[PDB]
Amino acid sequence: MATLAPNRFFFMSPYRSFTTSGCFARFDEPAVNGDSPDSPFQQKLAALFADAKAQGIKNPVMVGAIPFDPRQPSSLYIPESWQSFSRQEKQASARRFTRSQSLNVVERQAIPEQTTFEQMVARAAALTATPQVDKVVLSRLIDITTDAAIDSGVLLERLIAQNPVSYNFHVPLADGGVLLGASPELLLRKDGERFSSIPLAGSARRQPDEVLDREAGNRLLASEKDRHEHELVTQAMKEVLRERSSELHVPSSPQLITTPTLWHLATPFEGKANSQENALTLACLLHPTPALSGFPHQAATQVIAELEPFDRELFGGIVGWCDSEGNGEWVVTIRCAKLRENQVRLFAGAGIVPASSPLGEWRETGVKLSTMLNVFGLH
Ligand SMILES: C=C(O[C@H]1C=CC=C(C(=O)O)[C@@H]1O)C(=O)O
Ligand SMILES: [Mg+2]
Ligand SMILES: [Mg+2]
């Protein structure tokens, strides 16, 4: 009953699921202007890829995470090797994994707490009613200190068991840490010439019984707050993708998708892109989406910087991989945690427009945090 070592990358996806071994070269280069092959980011990336193939490695991948603010340094690296696994096989082994960790929390801190958060929500809702911004997303944290170092392998087993369907990731950080999570949001898949993105925005709690549950979702489909929330996201990426895609299909209405925790509204984007493009050039172009920063992007970037009493770092960024041949997959870094020794930080954001109530968003972010609290066996 072996668990994953904290110095391995792991990625579980309906596209490609693999683990990695060892480390060839680290890659800290900021991803800013990564949507443009003339960028130092892409150049150094290309260099490092040719460097790696010249050095003997067949089929190099670049795995890891990129922070919310792409000016900041990146958590990417080429492993020595990688090894495919069966997503379904893994779901099954995880569900049978029995041996846990007795873990006692010695501190639990909400940052910020209910009252401050509600004022941040009120002050942001009001700025979206004005001409300055239409949508800002605001987040909060839960910091947890435990009395023994947290085994990240056992926790990954639990996360998979509780979240069989999501993009489940486990990434080694340059400090000795681990970024760990169960993301439902595809930011960018590129499979040959073909690409897709599946933005989410708008949520409703799921219910214990499949009658009051199957309508909670129907209600989400009707909800105008959430539908407007959602529309703000899709129009933005349409425009951005306009002169970057050969062809492009986007439904004008969202569809329901599930989390063990949440109903969300989704819009799948499908398209083809030029050979001038790769998984990262496209992922950099799209992220962050109005689902994670706001609209307009840079104007919401500033509200966020003045309201949030912390730095997001890797939270609200993207995690995934890309190869030397333009392929890859990138998911949004949400429903996640950073672990290092006996310290964990959880993250969740919403979801703010003129029609949002501060209690509403506080409790929403609450349900989103519970994906990762459940992995820890907390409430
Ligand atoms: C910022 C998060 O999720 C986005 C994804 C789906 C729905 C969202 C929402 O309804 O507000 C969020 O914008 C998070 O889970 O922390
Ligand atoms: Mg406005
Ligand atoms: Mg929301």
User: Does ligand 1 come within 6 angstroms of the Cβ of 312?
Assistant: no
Q: Is 185 a catalytic residue?
A: yes
Both tokens of 138, joined, read 């605001």
User: Does ligand 1 come within 6 angstroms of the Cβ of 185?
Assistant: yes
Query: According to the entry, how was the structure determined?
Result: X-ray
Choose among 39, 77, 41, 50: nearest CA to 61.
77
For the beta carbon of residue 268, count every other beta carbon within 10 angstroms. Answer: 15
Q: Flag whether 134 is marked binding.
A: yes
Q: Which domains does the chain have, with CATH numbers?
A: 1-379 (3.60.120.10)
SS (H, E, C) 193-208: CEEEEECEEEEEECCC
Asked if residues 220 and 226 have their Cβ atoms less than 8 Å apart, the reply is yes
Resolution to 1 decimal place, in Å: 2.3
SS (H, E, C) the chain: CCCCCCCCCEEECCCCCEEEECCCEEECCCCCCCCCCCCHHHHHHHHHHHHHHHCCCCCCEEEEEECCCCCCCCEEEECCEEEECCHHHHHHHHHHCCCCCCCCEEEEEEECCHHHHHHHHHHHHHHHHCCCCCEEEEEEEEEEEECCCCCHHHHHHHHHHHCCCCEEEEEECCCCCEEEEEECCEEEEEECCEEEEECEEEEEECCCCCCCCCCHHHHHHHCHHHHHHHHHHHHHHHHHHHCCEEEEECCCCCEEEECCCEEEEECCEEEEECCCCCHHHHHHHHCCCCCCCEECHHHHHHHHHHHCCCCCCCCCCEEEEEECCCCEEEEECCCEEEEECCEEEEEEEEEECCCCCHHHHHHHHHHHHHHHHHHHCCC
User: Does ligand 1 come within 6 angstroms of the Cβ of 348?
Assistant: yes
Asked if residues 364 and 203 have their Cβ atoms less than 8 Å apart, the reply is yes
Q: Which of 29, 90, 157, 185 is catalytic?
A: 185
Please give the Cα distance from 127 to 323 (Å, whole number). 41
Alpha carbons within 13 A on the beta-carbon side of 373: 17
Pairing of strands 245-249, 75-78: unpaired
Provide the residue type at 19 as one letter.
T
Q: Flag whether 349 is marked binding.
A: yes
Strand partners, 82: 20
Please identify every residue whose CB atom is under 5 Å from ligand 3, which is an ion: 203, 350-351
